[PDB]
Design a protein around this nucleic acid. Sequence first.
RNA 1: CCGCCCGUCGCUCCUACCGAUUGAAAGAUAUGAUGAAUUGUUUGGACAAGAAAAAUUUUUUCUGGAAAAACCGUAAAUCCUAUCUUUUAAAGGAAGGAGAAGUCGUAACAAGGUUUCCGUAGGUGAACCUGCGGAAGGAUCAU
RNA 2: AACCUGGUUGAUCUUGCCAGUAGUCAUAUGCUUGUCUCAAAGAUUAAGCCAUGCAAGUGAAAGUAUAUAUAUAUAUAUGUAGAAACUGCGAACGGCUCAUUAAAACAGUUAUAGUCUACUUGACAUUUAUAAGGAUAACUACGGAAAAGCUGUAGCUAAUACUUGCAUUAUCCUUUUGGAUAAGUAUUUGUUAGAAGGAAUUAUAACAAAGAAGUAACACGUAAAGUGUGUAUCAAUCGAGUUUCUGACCUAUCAGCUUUUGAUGUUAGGGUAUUGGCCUAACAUGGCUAUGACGGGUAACGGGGAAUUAGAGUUCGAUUCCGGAGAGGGAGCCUGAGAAAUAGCUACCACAUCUAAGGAAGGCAGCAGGCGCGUAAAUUACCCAAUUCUAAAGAAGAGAGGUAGUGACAAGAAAUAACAAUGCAAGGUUUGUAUUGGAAUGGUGGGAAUUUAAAACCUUCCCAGAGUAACAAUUGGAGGGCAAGUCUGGUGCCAGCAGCCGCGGUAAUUCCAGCUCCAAUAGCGUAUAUUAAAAUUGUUGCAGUUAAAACGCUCGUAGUUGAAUUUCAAAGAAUCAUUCUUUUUAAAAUCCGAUUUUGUUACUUUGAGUAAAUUAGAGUGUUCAAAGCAAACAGUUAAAGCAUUGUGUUUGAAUACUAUAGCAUGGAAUAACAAAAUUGAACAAGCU
RNA 3: AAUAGAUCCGUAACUUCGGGAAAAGGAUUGGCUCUGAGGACAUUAAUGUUAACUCAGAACUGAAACGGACAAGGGGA
Lengths: 171, 257, 125
Amino acid sequence: RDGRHKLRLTGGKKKIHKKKRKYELGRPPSNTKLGSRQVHVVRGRGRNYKYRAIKLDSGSFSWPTFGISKNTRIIDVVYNASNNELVRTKTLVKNCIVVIDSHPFTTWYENTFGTTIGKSKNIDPLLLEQFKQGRVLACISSRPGQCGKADGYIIEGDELLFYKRKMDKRN
Amino acid sequence: GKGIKKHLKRVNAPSHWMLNKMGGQYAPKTSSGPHKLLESIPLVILLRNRLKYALTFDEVKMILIQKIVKVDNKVRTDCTFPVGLMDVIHITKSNEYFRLLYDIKGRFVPHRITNEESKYKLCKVKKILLRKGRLSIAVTHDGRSIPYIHPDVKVNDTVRLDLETGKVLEHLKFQVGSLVMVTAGHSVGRVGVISSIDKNMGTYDIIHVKDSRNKVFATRLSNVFVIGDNTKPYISLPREKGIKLDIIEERRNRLKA
Amino acid sequence: PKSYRNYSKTARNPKRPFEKERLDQELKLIGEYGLKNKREIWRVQYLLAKIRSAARYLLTLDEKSSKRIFQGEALLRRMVRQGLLGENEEKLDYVLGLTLPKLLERRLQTKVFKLGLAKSVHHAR
RNA sequence: CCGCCCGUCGCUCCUACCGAUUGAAAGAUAUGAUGAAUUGUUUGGACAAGAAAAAUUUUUUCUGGAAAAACCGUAAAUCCUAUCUUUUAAAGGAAGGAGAAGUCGUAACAAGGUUUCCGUAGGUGAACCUGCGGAAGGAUCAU
RNA sequence: AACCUGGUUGAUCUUGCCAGUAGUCAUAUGCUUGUCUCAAAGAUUAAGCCAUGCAAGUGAAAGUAUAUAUAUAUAUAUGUAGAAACUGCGAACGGCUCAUUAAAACAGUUAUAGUCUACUUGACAUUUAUAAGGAUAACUACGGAAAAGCUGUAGCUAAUACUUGCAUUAUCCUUUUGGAUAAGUAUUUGUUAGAAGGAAUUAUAACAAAGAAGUAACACGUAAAGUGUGUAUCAAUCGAGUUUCUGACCUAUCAGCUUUUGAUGUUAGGGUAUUGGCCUAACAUGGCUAUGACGGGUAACGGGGAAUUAGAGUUCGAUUCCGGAGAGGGAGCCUGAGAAAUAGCUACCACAUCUAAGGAAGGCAGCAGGCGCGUAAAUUACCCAAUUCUAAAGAAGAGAGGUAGUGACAAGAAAUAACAAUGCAAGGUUUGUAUUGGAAUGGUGGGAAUUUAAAACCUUCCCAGAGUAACAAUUGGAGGGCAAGUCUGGUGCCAGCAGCCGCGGUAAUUCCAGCUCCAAUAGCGUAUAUUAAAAUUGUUGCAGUUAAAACGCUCGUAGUUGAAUUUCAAAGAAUCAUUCUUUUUAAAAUCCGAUUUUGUUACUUUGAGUAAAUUAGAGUGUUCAAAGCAAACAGUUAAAGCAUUGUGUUUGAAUACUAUAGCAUGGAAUAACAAAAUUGAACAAGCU
RNA sequence: AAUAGAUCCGUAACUUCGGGAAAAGGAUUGGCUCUGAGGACAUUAAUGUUAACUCAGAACUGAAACGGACAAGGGGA
């Protein structure tokens, strides 16, 4: 399933021998969606248990500017750098964009410093407006098909502007 | 299936094991242990063809089940146990100690060792790994992970090991006066004090080492063993004393008798 | 599954087997030595040509060569042990210059003949 | 030289080639179609165990779950078309080679009786003849 | 041993091939065969089909033990064992065959800073307790069919099978000592710091979130405290997967191939034990090629290796070992650390078994053996004694493996006689030579010793056992090559022989025979393939006016090949008359009269990794040898060496090679490349 | 009777090299939610007024079926 029966770089055919071994394997992909927190376990070679996430709802999400992370829940998926039906069918991947909650981070802000380590960092007015709306975007960085959890980081700054302008000279 | 191979052909055995042609077809494949298969030898041929103590694999197995064999003051029943490059083997009731060293011919040979010297063993560390808690361990050629080495000890420095207490005693560096010995070179069996090190950019470090009889020969850094300083060899060398007498004059010495 | 007993030949066929000068020469020698058949008087030239080519390898090597003065005595010890020629000869040219009947002379069939026992070489054999 | 020899035509034998037969046979590659089995996911849903009530029975709840179905996925095997590879059936055709005192002719070897030869073109039963332009390997190294 | 001879002609010299010649571990086959050692053996074609029987199992302190049996003082405590069965490991090793395979496999050389890793070894750990809960075999009882290495319910028990769960440590302050602070291992995500390597986003440390799998609810008994089994992690072990750089046979009557069906690459993501078009989506039009791509063929597994060689080279390499593949053809899958496994399964195709007709089971390219094919290939034997593997690791297994049978595949040693005399021939009282007559030896028969898991073979001792040593050697020829016949008879262009030239019409040196001789001899012919011969493939090393062969001529790209020129030289010690060694002689930075580096590559010198077998070779008297890697030394029984009474000693299994590719390395020459004036520098002063 | 329009793909023998040819042979077109892309008019590299029918892939859908009627080659040796 891996590394053969392809064309040679010169364009010629490489006719097959060495009928498929097991260490190449190539297990079918797993599509994680919104649902209850149920996962499966797959046995990879050498007795390694892989945490296959078939449907996820919540995970760890980290504020990079404050260097913190808390557990919260994803409600929707809006975009991925890959194809579009992947996000239209509510799948999660290691660079997808999701919509993250605002209230737990707001409570962390209130308890740590207040106001509506390395504190006093001025944050960002657009992020504060998003928090006021209560619907803040984030980018998932963990690999749900491998690790089985959706660990993301809060998107900010110039990258936030880039991901926002491509969405809304726009429709 | 194509799993881990568990057979060794007699003709495929390492040369210094020295298995004959007509004495079968399979060689005793050393079980997984502290040293390589190619450069270490098992108890079977150590006790059958080197010590000439036994005559048949059944009789070799008949010996080790009685706990009358000890390596590093530790009992081992594994029949195909790789002894290692140099160690401290001990058979109890006969009150004798064999240490394994090299020959001028470049072989493995049991060497008579007294009790006090057999209490003295050396290990060449291969690399240092520091684990959680900022503690340091060194892995030796003996397949031993000795933790908490002296800070001055480096990747090439060797450490005196007290087998009974399992602790390091004295470090030995790699200076120009660091008397060493060749392990896996084509110049195996030559003991030398090193002349200079020739570091090369990102490839195996070839170093020149100087013999007692004023012969300079080079070998990779990977197959050197510091066995003492310029004062004297810390380990009793074999009869040949590690000095490679030349093949031309070997013959006149054998002719005279 | 294969017997590791290496085996080799000892005699090589002369090639062009119908030359009268060599046929008469080998008949003369087999008559002077009372031998059995041509396999024996073809094995001996195989032996002496083997050692002869070995020595001729050393002659091509220059003087003071570590290889020259290794086989120079390695071969010469065997030659003086067999007793091909006396003590007056020491040189690699001198061991190069051997003939065939002097190689036969070391055979046990005629040593007893020359030491007595039998009044004929056929009797000794 | 009463030498040597050429071709056509006769007879016998052998080899290869062309060959209609939508050639056939056989194999091997891409396409399309069908698609057994089967990994994974979803839908299940024989119960076997737990939570409740009465002093042998029942509803509801939570997991593990067997047959079975759908989906992408791996894909055997079979069939359509297209291509590549190997023999041969093949009526028959046209050759070549060999054997062989056969027939006719004089083609070349001498200035072979018409010097020989090339290329091209045409004719002729055949070797051959003829024209055009060349060569001497000519029969001339030479007013 | 770097080799030639016959054949074109009336005769000669050439070119030229045919034939001759020898080797083959290269196969078949004809004739013959007294011995011993040694031992190839269904590769060639059908990776065709298989009857049959076997080829993987395992318990000796240590998992479970009321099937049961036996012994210690009295139903009492221990035991010794233990069928079956649960559990654990292995069965993924090994053995076989070479279909497929053409930058694939392999080999050498790299990386994995892109990964996994059972058993073993060494270190070491984090968020009811005088010991917790179920789930079940074997087994009792009823059967089914013809059956499976088949099976249903009722009832029970365990274990090291399955499942829950019983502290404590470190850090900060007065500063031994009192308080306080804090408690997640791998793994994953976001933010900082950061002993080595060659380069870390390294080891590791800190902060904020998740976070499995554990730290023994287990069994045996050694110092005059221990072990097995099992558990989290790190490292090696035994390995494996990817992977760099280099190397391959023939073919152009294969020139342009790949790209919508991934082709070349980027991004992003899935998937893998991990990188990667491995896969998907978007994006870009790229990538290889006469230095031969893309195709085709191979009667092609690859490698070290084999034959042949003066050196070159040529051919072979299924086959002892290594790497790859497959188990009638594809494909899929669980298990397990490890299989896309076949004496594991599933489905299709082609065969094929039992059959009560319902239905079950199959893969000898494992070992013997059969059929089919073919020129071509062993016994349906014995044994784990030798080596080595599995296990719960001594006594059990292993068609692995050994031993034995057949075996003129090959290889090595070696019988079928010698001796005194007359007579004869030669010769100056010597050699050879139809007779007597006796010594000695085997083969052979037997008994024994020895030998082997058992027997036989080998060897040693004793009796019969050779005179035509009746205990009898053959194969191919006798024209030339090419040794041995115009010796004798049959035939007579017939029969025949003859690798080539040739012989055969009455005198056949060639046919058919007899005698003899010749070459080799327990071996010699025949056929095919291959090597040298062949300087008839020619780099060394061919030929081209007329023998074959200069394109009709010229241009011209790829290719091949390419003027000269840059640092000379001088002085001193040692052998034989020379040869050999040493020192310096401009300029730039380095050391306070002096300390020292001053283009790249090819090439060339040395080294490090250079599997074993095989190759040449050392040493070693298997009776020599093929061998093999041993053995030798004084010892009618003791001396020395040494140990503060006894304890053997010396030893050997080296060496070169393991490309041409890669690493380091000395380097004056020879070669190329750059720097060199449509302007380019160095130094000094000053400016930013 | 069998398709037969259009678009995209593919197209042999033979040949007078022009053809054969609509060769042969395939796929799509249905329905809708879509989307996107390809001219003239003006200001000191950019932003405003105003007129196409050609392509494309993701959906879902509807009775796995569509040039929906009309109109419109059967091919091959």
